From a paper:
Although other intermediate filament proteins have been demonstrated to form amyloids, KRT8 specifically has not previously been characterized as an amyloid-forming protein. This protein, like other alpha-keratin proteins, contains a central coiled-coil domain that is flanked by an amino-terminal head domain and a carboxy-terminal tail domain, which are both low complexity in sequence composition. KRT8 is known to aggregate pathologically, primarily in the form of MDBs in liver disease. Atomic structures of KRT8 LARKS reveal that pathogenic mutations convert the non-pleated wild-type protein into a pleated conformation, shedding light on the molecular mechanisms underlying aggregation-promoting mutations in low-complexity proteins.
Similarly, the structure of KRT852–58 (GGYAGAS) with the G55A mutation was also determined. High-resolution diffraction data were collected for the wild-type sequence (GGYGGAS) of KRT852–58, but we were unable to determine the structure, presumably owing to its adoption of a highly kinked conformation. Fortunately, a recently determined structure from hnRNPA1 (GGGYGGS) very closely resembles the wild-type KRT852–58 sequence, particularly the residues at and surrounding the mutation site, providing the needed comparison. The KRT852–58-G55A (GGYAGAS) structure forms an anti-parallel class-6 steric zipper, with sheets interacting through the tyrosine and two alanine residues, including the G55A mutant alanine. The glycine at the N terminus assumes a highly extended conformation, like the SGMGGIT structure. But, like the other mutant structure, the backbone at the mutant alanine is pleated. Comparison with GGGYGGS from hnRNPA1, which has the same GGYGG sequence motif as wild-type KRT852–58 (GGYGGAS), reveals that a glycine at that position adopts a highly extended backbone conformation. Similar to G62C, backbone overlay with the G55A mutation converts a non-pleated Gly55 into a pleated Ala55 (right). An overlay of both wild-type–mutant structure pairs highlights that mutations from wild-type glycines facilitate a transition in the backbone from a non-ideal, highly extended conformation to a pleated one. From these fibril structures, we observe that both the G62C and G55A mutations in KRT8 convert a non-pleated beta-sheet into a pleated one, transitioning a LARKS-like conformation into a steric zipper.
Residue numbers in the entry:
A (entry chain A), B (entry chain B), C (entry chain A), D (entry chain B), E (entry chain A), F (entry chain A), ...: 52 to 58
Write the structure that this text describes.
């Protein structure tokens, strides 16, 4: 499983 | 901003 | 399962 | 944000 | 079984 | 089993 | 940030 | 900034 | 089993 | 598993 | 920063 | 700056 975020 | 993920 | 959000 | 999981 | 949520 | 979260 | 894992 | 990862 | 996190 | 971040 | 590991 | 790694 995984994830990615950007702000 | 944004977020995504899965498993 | 998964998800994505953006603001 | 988000969450996912399973078994 | 499993689940996913996003807010 | 597994999981993934992102905030 | 994010987290993922499984067994 | 951003973050990503997986397992 | 394993894991990964990023902040 | 792995990760990458940038600010 | 980030962390990962497994066994 | 940035960081990356894996195992």
């Amino acid at each position: 499983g995984g994830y990615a975020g950007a702000s």
